[PDB]
From a paper:
Ubiquitin (Ub) is a small 76-amino-acid protein that functions as a post-translational modifier on a wide range of substrate proteins in the eukaryotic cell. Because Ub uses a common surface to interact with a wide variety of proteins with relatively low affinity, it is an attractive scaffold for engineering variants with greater specificity for select targets (Ernst et al., 2013, Leung et al., 2017). Using this method, we unexpectedly identified a dimeric UbV that is selective for the RING domain of XIAP (hereafter referred to as XR) (Gabrielsen et al., 2017). Using solution angle scattering and X-ray crystallography, we show that a single substitution of residue Gly10 to either Ala or Val is sufficient to convert Ub from a monomer to a dimer.
To investigate whether Ub74 G10V resembled the UbV.XR dimer, we determined the structure to a resolution of 2.23 Å from crystals grown from the dimeric gel-filtration fractions. Polder maps (Liebschner et al., 2017) confirm that the electron density for the β1β2 loop clearly extends between two adjacent chains such that β1 interacts with β2′ on a neighboring chain to form a β sheet. The complementary chains in each dimer pair have a complete elongated β1 strand. The dimer interface comprises around 1,800 Å2 of an overall accessible surface area of ∼6,000 Å2 for each subunit. There appears to be a certain degree of freedom around the dimerization arm, producing two distinct populations of dimers in the asymmetric unit. The first population consists of the chain pairs AB and IJ, which superpose with a root-mean-square deviation (RMSD) of 1.55 Å for 2,139 atoms, and the second population consists of chain pairs EF, KL, and GH, which all superpose with an RMSD of less than 0.8 Å for ∼2,000 atoms. The main source of divergence between these two populations arises due to differences in rotation between the two Ub bodies in the dimer subunits. The populations differ quite dramatically, with angles of 144° for AB, 159° for CD, and 163° for EF. A theoretical scattering curve calculated from the crystal structure fits well to the solution data with a χ2 value of 3.8 compared with the crystal structure of Ub74, which fits with a χ2 of 20.8, and the crystal structure of the Ub74 G10V dimer was easily superposed with the envelope calculated from the solution scattering data. A crystal structure of Ub74 G10V shows that the dimer interface resembles that of UbV.XR, and SAXS analyses suggest this dimer conformation is also present in solution.
Author numbering:
A (entry chain A), B (entry chain B): 0 to 73
The structure:
């Protein structure tokens, strides 16, 4: 009869396949391919630091099964 | 070649087909059908007010194409 919309906000953990030498920028692109989030809205955080696009995961000693935090720009 | 995890707060907006006389409990039942969230783990919000199970969409003046907000609770 009638349609309503429900906007949901959940805690979600995504898994990515990466190389220690991938840049933060390449990681944001992989997040886009999986979530449809453009890279310019993505803020990636590890151990309290904002991750810089032009650096690699190894630059931040992001190892296997490390967990990044993704926060979106408003 | 490694696996990493990215934890994010993800926004998903769902559409529901309802009648103005549907109870909130009936609406949560439809959310379960489409997202698999049981009604007691659902915190359903309209216009900043938490919606009560025994009340209808009309009671809260929820009209066509209205948007509700949902977060998960234990």
């Amino acid at each position: 009869s009638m349609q309503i919309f429900v906007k949901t906000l959940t805690v979600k953990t995504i898994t990515l396949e990466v190389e220690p030498s991938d840049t933060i920028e390449n990681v944001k692109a992989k997040i886009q391919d999986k979530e449809g989030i453009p890279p310019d809205q993505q803020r990636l955080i590890f151990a309290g630091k904002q991750l810089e696009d032009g650096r690699t995961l190894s630059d931040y000693n992001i190892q296997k099964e490390s967990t990044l935090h993704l926060v979106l720009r408003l």
